[PDB]
Amino acid sequence: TVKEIKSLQNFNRIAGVFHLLQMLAVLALANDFALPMTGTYLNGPPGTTFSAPVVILETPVGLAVALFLGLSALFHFIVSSGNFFKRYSKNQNIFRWVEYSLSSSVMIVLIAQICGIADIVALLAIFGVNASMILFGWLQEKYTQPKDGDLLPFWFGCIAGIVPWIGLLIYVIAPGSTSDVAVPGFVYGIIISLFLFFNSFALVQYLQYKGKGKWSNYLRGERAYIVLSLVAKSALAWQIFSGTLI
Amino acid sequence: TVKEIKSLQNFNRIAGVFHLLQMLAVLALANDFALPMTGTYLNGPPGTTFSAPVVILETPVGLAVALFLGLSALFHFIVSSGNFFKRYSKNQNIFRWVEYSLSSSVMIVLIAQICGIADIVALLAIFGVNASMILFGWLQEKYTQPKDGDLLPFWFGCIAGIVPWIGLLIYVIAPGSTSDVAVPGFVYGIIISLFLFFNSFALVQYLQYKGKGKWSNYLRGERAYIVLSLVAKSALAWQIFSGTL
Numbered sequence: 130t131v132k133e134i135k136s137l138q139n140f141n142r143i144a145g146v147f148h149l150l151q152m153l154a155v156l157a158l159a160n161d162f163a164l165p166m167t168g169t170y171l172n173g174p175p176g177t178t179f180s181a182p183v184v185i186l187e188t189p190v191g192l193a194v195a196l197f198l199g200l201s202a203l204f205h206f207i208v209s210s211g212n213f214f215k216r217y218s219k220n221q222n223i224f225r226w227v228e229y230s231l232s233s234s235v236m237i238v239l240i241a242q243i244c245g246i247a248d249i250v251a252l253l254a255i256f257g258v259n260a261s262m263i264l265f266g267w268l269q270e271k272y273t274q275p276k277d278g279d280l281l282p283f284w285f286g287c288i289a290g291i292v293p294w295i296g297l298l299i300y301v302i303a304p305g306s307t308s309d310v311a312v313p314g315f316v317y318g319i320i321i322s323l324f325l326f327f328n329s330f331a332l333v334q335y336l337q338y339k340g341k342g343k344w345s346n347y348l349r350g351e352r353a354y355i356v357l358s359l360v361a362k363s364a365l366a367w368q369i370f371s372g373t374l375i
Numbered sequence: 376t377v378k379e380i381k382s383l384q385n386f387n388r389i390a391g392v393f394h395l396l397q398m399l400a401v402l403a404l405a406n407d408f409a410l411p412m413t414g415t416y417l418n419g420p421p422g423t424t425f426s427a428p429v430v431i432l433e434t435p436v437g438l439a440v441a442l443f444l445g446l447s448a449l450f451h452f453i454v455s456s457g458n459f460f461k462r463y464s465k466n467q468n469i470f471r472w473v474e475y476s477l478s479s480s481v482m483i484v485l486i487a488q489i490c491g492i493a494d495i496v497a498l499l500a501i502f503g504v505n506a507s508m509i510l511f512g513w514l515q516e517k518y519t520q521p522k523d524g525d526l527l528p529f530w531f532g533c534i535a536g537i538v539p540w541i542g543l544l545i546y547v548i549a550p551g552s553t554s555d556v557a558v559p560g561f562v563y564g565i566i567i568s569l570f571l572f573f574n575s576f577a578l579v580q581y582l583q584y585k586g587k588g589k590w591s592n593y594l595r596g597e598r599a600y601i602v603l604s605l606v607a608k609s610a611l612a613w614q615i616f617s618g619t620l
């Protein structure tokens with residue numbers, strides 16, 4: 130109903146306000162914590178020798194955390210004018226796909242650096258393939274309705290989506306570890322929680338397109354997504370905050 | 376026409392054979408050259424320090440070459456029994472997409488390792504995002520025809536596609552170079568040649584769905600893909616062969 134549409138304008142505006150408040154809070158309180166992006170270039174032939182790692186760029190973590198919070202705050206304020214409905218008049222939500230393409234990619238990169246993924250190409254590619262996951266979900270919503278035909282776009286998203294995490298799992302397990310590799314307790318919590326949040330985002334899409342009575346109303350799904358952006362970003366933002374100090 | 380389809384059954388079988396002959400050549404003559412995939416794991420917390428880089432897995436390059444050649448050989452022989460024909464009886468070719476999803480990801484990973492990219496997660500991710508490019512192109516053929524709405528999967532693919540080349544450029548330019556860094560001339564040849572070949576694959580897809588007079592025959596596009604797959608995989612296979620042996 131349009132009455133639900135109206136509640137969504139108010140709902141988004143509040144979601145944005147919470148993201149905005151936390152963004153400012155982090156900006157006020159966070160220290161100057163930075164993580165490295167490096168390159169290990171060749172000293173010659175491909176399989177002969179490598180030049181020692183050079184730090185190309187560093188990531189100001191507090192600003193980066195504020196950044197993905199800022200992206201949600203911003204997009205919710207844009208949406209609050211009723212534009213997402215104006216783009217309907219099932220529904221489709223491009224605003225969300227653009228927002229997530231940016232913010233979920235910003236934050237998966239943070240998680241990687243936290244694990245120890247320093248290489249600049251790795252972090253770039255992870256950002257790219259995470260964006261692909263979001264863009265596949267967008268294509269699901271663009272070309273199909275809640276019917277059998279939505280399978281592929283979704284599952285292509287799952288393929289692009291699962292990879293980043295597999296990379297993290299490699300570093301968490303550390304196949305080449307020589308016993309001096311310790312992963313912090315707060316890191317393990319960040320990975321698990323955020324992984325479980327990413328799974329629920331996939332779950333919303335699935336159920337929404339599967340068509341379960343409850344989720345036959347697109348707007349229940351829309352609202353559930355908005356909460357997940359809010360809860361998952363908050364969770365990571367304050368876990369990293371606490372962990373930076375720990 | 377169905378006549379053209381039968382011609383394509385032969386054309387694939389011949390292309391497959393050309394891929395197979397080059398595969399077996401490499402397997403016969405190639406060295407035991409291999410490139411490392413590494414992990415540089417943290418010792419402690421994020422901002423402390425790192426443990427020495429460890430080689431997790433090394434890539435047998437000759438075999439990796441035979442792998443993307445063989446995969447093409449394999450799918451061309453499969454197709455040659457007249458399976459893809461059902462899309463005519465613009466069409467679709469998911470044998471292409473399944474094949475390319477694998478074989479071109481194998482070969483882009485090789486190029487990365489040739490450039491000095493060794494981080495196992497980087498190479499994992501590059502592979503993943505290259506597959507995403509192919510899968511976007513698949514979706515272009517699945518849900519669209521020669522109409523405006525065809526563009527979006529294509530452009531999503533272009534984005535996912537360029538990300539690997541951006542990474543390669545980082546290692547070629549070497550922003551943090553301290554003057555001891557050097558890249559072999561043959562690597563510049565590999566990158567430029569294959570980069571143009573990857574661009575032309577997109578060019579075909581574009582012109583085919585753009586509906587340019589010539590390319591309004593879907594099977595003309597198909598023939599282009601068969602030739603490009605052959606030449607681009609060949610070009611890389613032998614440039615690597617020359618440079619590693």
Ligand SMILES: *C/C=C(C)/C=C/C=C(C)/C=C/C1=C(C)CCCC1(C)C
Pocket residue numbers: 201229232233262263264265266267282283286287290326327328330331334357358359361362
């Ligand atoms: C702050 C916003 C966040 C963390 C949004 C994350 C979005 C997801 C993890 C979406 C994932 C999807 C799948 C895994 C399958 C394809 C459909 C999506 C885009 C809903």
Ligand SMILES: *C/C=C(C)/C=C/C=C(C)/C=C/C1=C(C)CCCC1(C)C
Pocket residue numbers: 475478479508509510511512513515528529530531532533536573574576577580604607608
């Ligand atoms: C051996 C086969 C190879 C090297 C195939 C390469 C395929 C591509 C580079 C396809 C690229 C595409 C775009 C860049 C846009 C999206 C559509 C595609 C898949 C045609």
Ligand SMILES: CCCCCCCCCCCCCCCC(=O)O
Pocket residue numbers: 207223224227
């Ligand atoms: C399209 C993404 C490019 C990157 C920068 C985008 C900044 C966000 C702009 C808001 C997009 C909201 C949806 C707009 C829908 C439309 O294009 O008509």
Ligand SMILES: CCCCCCCCCCCCCCCC(=O)O
Pocket residue numbers: 385388389392
């Ligand atoms: C390496 C030199 C070229 C290899 C030649 C491969 C030929 C494969 C195609 C088989 C031709 C027979 C096709 C049967 C029907 C027909 O000719 O129309």
